[PDB]
Amino acid sequence: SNPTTFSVEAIAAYTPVALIRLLNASGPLQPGHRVDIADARSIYTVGAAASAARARANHNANTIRRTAMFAETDPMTWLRPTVGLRRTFNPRII
Amino acid sequence: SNPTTFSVEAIAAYTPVALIRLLNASGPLQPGHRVDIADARSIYTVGAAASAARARANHNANTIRRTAMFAETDPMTWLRPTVGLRRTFNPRII
Amino acid sequence: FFSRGGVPMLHDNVTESLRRITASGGRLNPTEPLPIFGGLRPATSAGIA
Amino acid sequence: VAEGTEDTLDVQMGRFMETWADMMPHHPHWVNEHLTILQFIAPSNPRLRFELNPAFDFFVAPGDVDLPGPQRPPEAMPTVNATLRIINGNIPVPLCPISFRDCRGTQLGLGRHTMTPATIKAVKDTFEDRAYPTIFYMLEAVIHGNERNFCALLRLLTQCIRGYWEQSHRVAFVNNFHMLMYITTYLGNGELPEVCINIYRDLLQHVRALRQTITDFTIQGEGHNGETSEALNNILTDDTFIAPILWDCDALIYRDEAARDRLPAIRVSGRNGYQALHFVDMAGHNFQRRDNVLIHGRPVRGDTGQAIPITPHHDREWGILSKIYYYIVIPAFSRGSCCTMGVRYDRLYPALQAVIVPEIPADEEAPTTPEDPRHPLHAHQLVPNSLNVYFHNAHLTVDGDALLTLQELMGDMAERTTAILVSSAPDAGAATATTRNMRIYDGALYHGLIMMAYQAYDETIATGTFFYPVPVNPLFACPEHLASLRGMTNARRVLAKMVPPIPPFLGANHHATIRQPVAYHVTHSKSDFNTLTYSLLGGYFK
Amino acid sequence: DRLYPALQAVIVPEIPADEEAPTTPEDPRHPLHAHQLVPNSLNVYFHNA
Amino acid sequence: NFCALLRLLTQCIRGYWEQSHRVAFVNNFHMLMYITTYLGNGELPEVCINIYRDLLQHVRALRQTITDFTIQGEGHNGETSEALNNILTDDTFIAPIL
Amino acid sequence: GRPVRGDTGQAIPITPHHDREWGILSKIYYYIVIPAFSRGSCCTMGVRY
């Protein structure tokens, strides 16, 4: 964040961004300057994907851990077969 | 349990296991060692059923006792006929 | 299948099998050994009704 | 017709697959029933010179070979053999058509019992269902047609059948014959809803109506050498002819007792003859058994013991109704799509040991809805590789004690499935001085199974984990279920698309009783679901 | 002689005064409840039906 | 991806069905296979899965109709009889969308 | 695409996801059922990821 050049959509596009539900691009985003850079769209896309999985962080003290889903060959598989959960339940744990 | 060589899934498979809801084989189960022994699957199968019938322990102070189910010749049988319960009721006693 | 001279198919087993199914369910057919240097006459039969 | 070699039926089927990959160099001549009368009659047909008698099938067989022989057929000069055509529908379809059989079936079932269209629709829906849950298959495999094992599980079975019915309006457990007997008997006083027991009772009434039609078209009082008139006219009333799937050893008892003059032979996985030792438990389960010992199951009104001899569980009418069901009602509804397979009990019983029923405290009410943490199918207790994930995949809700009845079921078990190949001379009506040399070989699977339809794109369970295809009938052949077999190629898949794969240690086509034309009749007829059954019954006359 | 001794055993419990008679079989005061479903009585004959 | 998004797709198909009585995700062939195989045990209502299974049954009936009107056991140069007679059973011809 | 039962890697070659029957059913669906219902109104197109 600091002093790592907060995003103002001229040159400050950077992958380690940390925001969620940002109302920045949607209206407080006065138009782009006279700066060429083209792959800032791909920088934001990886950045927003990283800033959404990091924005999860919690909700995993409530949602139970992910499981095998399919049926692969687990490291034993010689004293019990493998069957995966079809994720149709409601993970909340309360 | 002790000193009866707790199950580390190399050679320590033994019939008098006393566990229930064991999430040991399902994920904390680093792969099988360089030991020949093949009939540990049969040892585990008898052991798990012994570790599940013993894992009842309670639930017999709650449900009613098992009955004759069908109609056999019980030792009296000359002053009353015999009819067994069809186990479709809900045994809970509360 | 009594005539020779046209362009053949690339696979010989295709032509042989095609002649084999064509011969099934018919009266007059070329003889089974396919006599090279010959007129491809149909096999003669028994009496005529 | 080969012989058994005391293997575990997975190795033998694989060896048959490697043999059959290059055993056939060309298309066999007994499959081509797609010819009409004009194509069969035409002189280019190579089969026309081998159709002479109306009650004999002439084929080409290896010479100087007594028919039950080794796995590899010995090389010898070919000779022409013959085998008696017992069933009158075994005449080939160009000579006895489908339309004639359907019109004869319409003539047969004029005033007899017919099935209501609601039961027909529900049974047709559950026979063509590919998302049929495997939990029913495992429950039918473990219960294995024992009355005590069924009636120890009445709560769980009632909940399972109700949950499968009032979520998709399809009936359950119609696969096995020793399930609808027990449902119509025990779960028929009001445990199930009003519409389920109506479907089961309608199926049973149709089976008994077919039996009554068989009794009607015979004339009683003519018994020749220990054979009743029903067993001397029909085949579904013949005790020598057995069911494709055997659950109890009483069928072999009645077959060995009733025939008694036509020279019998039973080959159960190697050695000759069965043993039928009952009451197998955890201490002496012995999943890898190489003997010929079968599991008869516990007789309940008696003592099991050691020196106590075995007895039939049920009446002689049970075998007749089982044969009628398995040979009429199943191929009329599945229409040649069902396939018989065995089971892998050493991979199924450890998958049944894991129940995650929690510890409800004392003086507390049992939870019903699955939204509380105390329910066993709540997401907190859906630990992988248990039975709770197995029941949650099928979206069927169960209680704690219904899952805990598995331990009471677990007292009686089944070791493994084995192939029983029976053999006999023809009956006393057709036993002349030259037909006694001809024999009929038809195999059956002890503790087998049947699936209604095959799913290949369901990856929640790995393929071949529990069931492996061992098909024994022309009716029960399966070009699609062979993907469940381990190590399958597409060349074998297109090889089995034209020829029904029946292994030679379970009988051959030209030596069995049920042959190719009746399977062609059940798979290429579109008439009805009631006229097809009576047409199939009319085909099963000697 | 094998029916009237089978009709003797009725397991109707003792309900105290100023208490409502049970109708549903879920409460333990009902004759058809699983608590008073003792074998070889008329209650198991009615429960099998 | 479908087996990970099972819950969201169940809610989406249910919300689209019991407000306008129209079947959803019918455009893709790799959607109704996954609906019938996975979402076919009661997650969807009783009428939706009947529609998907009836469409799949009709597709397999068309396949069996193709299989019936050929003669098996006659194949030239690594081509089965179905591919030599028909095009929907010919592996050289490809789907419009891959 | 990511394989269902296996490890991706880089030296591991590509394996088909489904059976050969899936291709047949996809061809049958896309060339029969889609043009029978839409009747020439549906259009195949790409996407902008």
How far does F94 lie from chain C, in Å, by closest CA? Answer: 25
Resolution of the PDB structure in angstroms: 3.7
Chain B residue numbers touching A76 (CB-CB < 8 A):
9, 25, 29, 31-32
Nearest CA in chain D to A92: D379
Cβ atoms of D446 and D341 within 8 Å: the answer is no
Say if the Cβ atoms of D350 and A80 lie within 8 Å: yes
G to F contact (≥3 Cβ pairs closer than 8 Å): yes
User: Three-state DSSP class for E49?
Assistant: coil
Which H or E run includes F83?
Answer: helix F81-85
Q: What subunits make at least 3 CB pairs under 8 angstroms with E?
A: B
Nearest CA in chain A to B41: A79
Say if the Cβ atoms of D384 and A90 lie within 8 Å: no
Chain G residue numbers touching F27 (CB-CB < 8 A):
34, 42
Angle at A25 between CA A19 and CA A27, to 5 degrees: 130
Pick from A69, A89, A90: which is nearest to F4 by CB?
A69
Cβ atoms of D336 and D497 within 8 Å: the answer is no
Chain D residue numbers touching G5 (CB-CB < 8 A):
459, 462
Cβ atoms of B85 and E47 within 8 Å: the answer is yes
Q: CA D479 to CA F81: how far, in whole Å?
A: 16
- Provide the β-strand partners of residue D451: D339
| DSSP 8-state code for residue E35 | T
Q: Which amino acid is at D202?
A: D
Q: CA D450 to CA D432: how far, in whole Å?
A: 38
Angle at A27 between CA A25 and CA A32, to 5 degrees: 60
Tokens coding B64: 């009613």
Cβ contacts below 8 Å, chain C against chain D, sum to 6
Residue D53 C-alpha from the chain's centroid: 32
Say if the Cβ atoms of A75 and B44 lie within 8 Å: no
Cβ atoms of A13 and A47 within 8 Å: the answer is yes
Say if the Cβ atoms of A79 and B30 lie within 8 Å: no
Total residues belonging to chain G? 49
Cβ atoms of D147 and D393 within 8 Å: the answer is no
Chain B residue numbers touching E35 (CB-CB < 8 A):
64, 93
- Provide the β-strand partners of residue D541: D234
CA-based nearest residue to D361, from E35, E26, B51, B94: B94
Cβ contacts below 8 Å, chain A against chain F, sum to 17
Say if the Cβ atoms of A81 and D395 lie within 8 Å: no
CA-based nearest residue to D420, from D447, D449, D440, D439: D447
How far does A80 lie from chain F, in Å, by closest CA? Answer: 23
Chain B residue numbers touching E40 (CB-CB < 8 A):
80-83
Q: CA E11 to CA E29: how far, in whole Å?
A: 11
Residue D151 buriedness (CB in 10 A; 0-12 / 13-18 / 19+):
buried
Say if the Cβ atoms of D457 and G4 lie within 8 Å: no
Task: Look up tokens 């199951």; give the residue.
Answer: D297
Q: CA D347 to CA D465: how far, in whole Å?
A: 7
Total residues belonging to chain B? 94
Pick from F27, F30, F93: which is nearest to G27 by CB?
F93
> Which residues make Cβ contacts (< 8 Å) with residue A6, sequence separation at least 6?
A12
**Strand order across the beta sheet in which D440-446 lies:** D245-246, D440-446, D418-424, D265-268
Helix pair angle (F48-68, F6-20), 10° resolution:
100
Tokens coding D454: 């095959």
Chain B residue numbers touching A80 (CB-CB < 8 A):
25-26
Total residues belonging to chain F? 98
CA-based nearest residue to D268, from D531, D534, D5, D537: D5
How far does D125 lie from chain C, in Å, by closest CA? Answer: 42
Nearest CA in chain A to F7: A88
Instruction: Say whether residue C4 is in contact with chain F using an 8 A CB cutoff.
Output: no
**Pairing, β D440-446 against β D245-246:** parallel
* ω into A3 cis (within 30 of 0): yes
> Which residues make Cβ contacts (< 8 Å) with residue D205, sequence separation at least 6?
D113
In angstroms and rounded to an integer, the radius of gyration of the C-alpha atoms of chain D is: 24
Q: CA D282 to CA D412: how far, in whole Å?
A: 9
User: Three-state DSSP class for D269?
Assistant: coil
Residue C26 buriedness (CB in 10 A; 0-12 / 13-18 / 19+):
exposed
Write out the residues of chain D at the interface with chain F, using a CB-CB cutoff of 8 A.
26-27, 34, 128-131, 133, 167-169, 393-395, 455, 457-460, 494, 497-498, 524
Phi and psi for B12 in degrees, rounded to 5?
-85, 25
Nearest CA in chain G to F58: G33
Q: Cα–Cα distances in Å, from G23 out to D456, G30, G43?
A: 14, 10, 21
b/e burial code for range B17-42 (CB count within 10 A of at least 16 → b): beebeeeebbeebeeeeeeeeeebbb
Task: Look up tokens 């990091």; give the residue.
Answer: A54
G to C contact (≥3 Cβ pairs closer than 8 Å): no
Q: CA C4 to CA D99: how far, in whole Å?
A: 45
Chain C residue numbers touching D94 (CB-CB < 8 A):
none
Q: Which amino acid is at D136?
A: F
How far does G47 lie from chain A, in Å, by closest CA? Answer: 17
Residues after which chain B is broken (C–N above 2.5 A) are: none
How far does G43 lie from chain F, in Å, by closest CA? Answer: 11
* ω into D479 cis (within 30 of 0): no
Say if the Cβ atoms of F43 and D395 lie within 8 Å: yes
Helix pair angle (D177-185, D194-216), 10° resolution:
120
How many other CB atoms are found less than 10 A from the CB of residue A81? 18
Classify the C-alpha dihedral D407-D411-D416-D421 as positive or negative.
Answer: negative
> Which residues make Cβ contacts (< 8 Å) with residue D284, sequence separation at least 6?
none
Which H or E run includes D183?
Answer: helix D177-185
Cβ atoms of D472 and D98 within 8 Å: the answer is no
Chain F residue numbers touching A86 (CB-CB < 8 A):
3, 6, 38
Write out the residues of chain B at the interface with chain A, using a CB-CB cutoff of 8 A.
9, 25-27, 29-32, 40-41, 44-45
Nearest CA in chain A to F11: A88
Instruction: Say whether residue C24 is in contact with chain D using an 8 A CB cutoff.
Output: yes
Tokens coding A42: 């791909």
Tokens coding F38: 């996975």
Phi and psi for D250 in degrees, rounded to 5?
-75, -25
Chain D residue numbers touching B62 (CB-CB < 8 A):
360, 362
Residue by residue, DSSP assigns D28-63 as -TTS-----HHHHHSTT-TTGGG---TTEEEEEEET
Cβ contacts below 8 Å, chain A against chain B, sum to 21
E to G contact (≥3 Cβ pairs closer than 8 Å): no
Alpha helix (H) residue ranges in D217-361 = 229-233, 250-258, 316-324, 330-334
User: Three-state DSSP class for E14?
Assistant: coil
G-interface mutation test, from A41, A72, A82, A86, most G Cβ less than 10 A away: A72
Q: Which amino acid is at D130?
A: R
